[PDB]
CSV table of C-alpha atoms in Angstrom, one decimal:
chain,number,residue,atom,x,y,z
A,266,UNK,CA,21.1,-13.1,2.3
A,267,UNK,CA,19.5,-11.6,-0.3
A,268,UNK,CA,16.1,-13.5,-1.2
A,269,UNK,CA,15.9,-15.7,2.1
A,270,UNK,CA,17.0,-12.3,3.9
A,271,UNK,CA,14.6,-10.5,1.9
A,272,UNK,CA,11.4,-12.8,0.7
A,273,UNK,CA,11.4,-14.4,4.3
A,274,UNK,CA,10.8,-11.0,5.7
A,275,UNK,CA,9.0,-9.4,3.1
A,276,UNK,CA,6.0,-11.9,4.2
A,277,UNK,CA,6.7,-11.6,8.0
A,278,UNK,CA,6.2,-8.0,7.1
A,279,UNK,CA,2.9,-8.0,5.6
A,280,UNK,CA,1.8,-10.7,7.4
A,281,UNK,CA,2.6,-9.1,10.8
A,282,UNK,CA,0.9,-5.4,9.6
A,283,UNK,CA,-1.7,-7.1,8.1
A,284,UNK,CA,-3.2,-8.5,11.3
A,285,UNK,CA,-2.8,-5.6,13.9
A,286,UNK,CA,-5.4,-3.9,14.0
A,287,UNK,CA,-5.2,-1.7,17.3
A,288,UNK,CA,-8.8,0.7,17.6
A,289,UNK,CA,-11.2,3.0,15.9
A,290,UNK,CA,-11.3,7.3,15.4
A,291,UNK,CA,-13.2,9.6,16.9
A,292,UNK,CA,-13.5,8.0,20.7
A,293,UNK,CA,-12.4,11.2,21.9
A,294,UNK,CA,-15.2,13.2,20.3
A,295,UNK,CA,-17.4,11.0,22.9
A,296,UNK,CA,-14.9,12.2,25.6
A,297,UNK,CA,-15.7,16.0,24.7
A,298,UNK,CA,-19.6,15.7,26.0
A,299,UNK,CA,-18.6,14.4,29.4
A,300,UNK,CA,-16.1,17.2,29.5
A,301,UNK,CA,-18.4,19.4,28.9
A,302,UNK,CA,-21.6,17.8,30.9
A,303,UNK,CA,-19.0,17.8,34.0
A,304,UNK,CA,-18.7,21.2,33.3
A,305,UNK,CA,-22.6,21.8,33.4
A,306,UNK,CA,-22.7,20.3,37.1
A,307,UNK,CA,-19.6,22.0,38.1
A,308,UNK,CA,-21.0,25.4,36.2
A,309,UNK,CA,-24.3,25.7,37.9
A,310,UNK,CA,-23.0,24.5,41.0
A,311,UNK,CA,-20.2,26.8,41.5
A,312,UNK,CA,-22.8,29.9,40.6
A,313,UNK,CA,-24.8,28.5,43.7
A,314,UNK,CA,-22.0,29.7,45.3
A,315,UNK,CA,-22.1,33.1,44.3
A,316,UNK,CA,-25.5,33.1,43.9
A,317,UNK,CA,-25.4,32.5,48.2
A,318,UNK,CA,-22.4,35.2,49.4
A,319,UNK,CA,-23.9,38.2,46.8
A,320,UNK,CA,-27.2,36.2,47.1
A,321,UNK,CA,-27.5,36.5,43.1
A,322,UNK,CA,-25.7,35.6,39.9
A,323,UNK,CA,-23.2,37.5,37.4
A,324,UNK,CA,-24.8,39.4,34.7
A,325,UNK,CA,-23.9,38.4,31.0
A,326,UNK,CA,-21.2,41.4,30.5
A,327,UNK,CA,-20.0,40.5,34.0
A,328,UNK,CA,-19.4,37.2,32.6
A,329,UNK,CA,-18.3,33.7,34.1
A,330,UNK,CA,-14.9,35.4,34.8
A,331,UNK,CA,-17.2,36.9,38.2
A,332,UNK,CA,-16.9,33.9,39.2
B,132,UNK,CA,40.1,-18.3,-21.7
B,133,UNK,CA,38.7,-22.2,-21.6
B,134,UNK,CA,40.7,-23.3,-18.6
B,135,UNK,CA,41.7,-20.1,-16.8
B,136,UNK,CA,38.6,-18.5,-17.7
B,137,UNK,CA,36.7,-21.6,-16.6
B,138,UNK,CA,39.0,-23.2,-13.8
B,139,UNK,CA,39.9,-20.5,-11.8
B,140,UNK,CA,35.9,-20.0,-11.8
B,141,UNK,CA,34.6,-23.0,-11.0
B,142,UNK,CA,36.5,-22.5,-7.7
B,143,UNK,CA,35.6,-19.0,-7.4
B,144,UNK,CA,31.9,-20.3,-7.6
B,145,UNK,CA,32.0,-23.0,-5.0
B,146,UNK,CA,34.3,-20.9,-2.5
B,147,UNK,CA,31.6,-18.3,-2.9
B,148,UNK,CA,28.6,-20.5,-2.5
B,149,UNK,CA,30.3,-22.3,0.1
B,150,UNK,CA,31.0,-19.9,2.6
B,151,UNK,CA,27.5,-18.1,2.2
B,152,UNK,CA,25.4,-19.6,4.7
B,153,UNK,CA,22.4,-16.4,5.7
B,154,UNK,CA,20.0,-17.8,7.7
B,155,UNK,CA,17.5,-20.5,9.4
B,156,UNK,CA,13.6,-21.3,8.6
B,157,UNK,CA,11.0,-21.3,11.0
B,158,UNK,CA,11.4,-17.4,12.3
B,159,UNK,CA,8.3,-16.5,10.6
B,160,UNK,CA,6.6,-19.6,12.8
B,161,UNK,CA,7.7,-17.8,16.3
B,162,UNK,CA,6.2,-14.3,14.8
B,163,UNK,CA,2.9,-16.3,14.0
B,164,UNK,CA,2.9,-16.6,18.2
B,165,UNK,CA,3.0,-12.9,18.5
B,166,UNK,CA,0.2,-11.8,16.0
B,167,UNK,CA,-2.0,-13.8,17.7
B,168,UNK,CA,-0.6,-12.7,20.8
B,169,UNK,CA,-1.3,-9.1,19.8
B,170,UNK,CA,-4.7,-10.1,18.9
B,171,UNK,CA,-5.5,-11.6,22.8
B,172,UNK,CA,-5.4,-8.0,24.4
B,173,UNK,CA,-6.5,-6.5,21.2
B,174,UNK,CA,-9.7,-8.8,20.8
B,175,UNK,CA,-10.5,-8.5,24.6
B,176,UNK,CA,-9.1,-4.9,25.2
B,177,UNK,CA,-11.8,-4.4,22.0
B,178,UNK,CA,-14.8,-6.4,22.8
B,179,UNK,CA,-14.5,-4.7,26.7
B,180,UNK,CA,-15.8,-1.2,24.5
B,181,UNK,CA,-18.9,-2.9,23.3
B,182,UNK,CA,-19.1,-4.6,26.7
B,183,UNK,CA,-19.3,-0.6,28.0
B,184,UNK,CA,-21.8,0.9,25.4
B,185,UNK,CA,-24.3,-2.0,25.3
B,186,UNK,CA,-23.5,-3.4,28.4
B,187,UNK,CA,-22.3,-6.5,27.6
B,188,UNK,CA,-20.3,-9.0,25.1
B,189,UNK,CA,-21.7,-10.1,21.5
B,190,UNK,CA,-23.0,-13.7,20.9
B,191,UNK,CA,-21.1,-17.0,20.2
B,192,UNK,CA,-23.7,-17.0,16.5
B,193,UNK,CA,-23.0,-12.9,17.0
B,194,UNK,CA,-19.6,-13.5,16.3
B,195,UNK,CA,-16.9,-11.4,16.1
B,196,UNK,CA,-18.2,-9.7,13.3
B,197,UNK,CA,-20.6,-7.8,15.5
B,198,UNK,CA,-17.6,-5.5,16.6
């Protein structure tokens, strides 16, 4: 109740933390360039767009907002 | 102070000890189950990220230690 309560658990404890090991840091850093390359594709190819009605593209001031 | 101070112990101690059962032995055998458990989807759910990047599963020789 107080060392068999205790001791017992006290292993259980360390013994059960010890051994869970779930995953590593920094996965999603890897997760940012895809974000961004899907941007790239979806970028360029939703200037096309504007680049076919106004048959050109945005100027820099005019900015992506244009779009 | 030799008998009642003794006496009325000595009962005192076995009706204490006697009615202070806690617990069993063996819990921590059913938790071992578990970590290892854990470790299953863990160890798979792991190796299935360096099955992604290189395109495939380490060695038997390789070992786990690749990961």
């Amino acid at each position: 109740f107080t060392l068999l309560e205790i001791m017992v658990v006290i292993v259980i404890l360390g013994v059960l933390a010890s051994l869970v090991v779930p995953n590593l840091m920094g996965n999603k850093e890897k997760a940012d360039r895809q974000k961004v390359v899907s941007d790239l594709v979806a970028l360029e190819g939703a200037l096309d767009m504007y680049k076919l009605d106004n048959s050109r593209y945005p100027t820099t001031e005019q900015g992506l907002q244009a779009l």
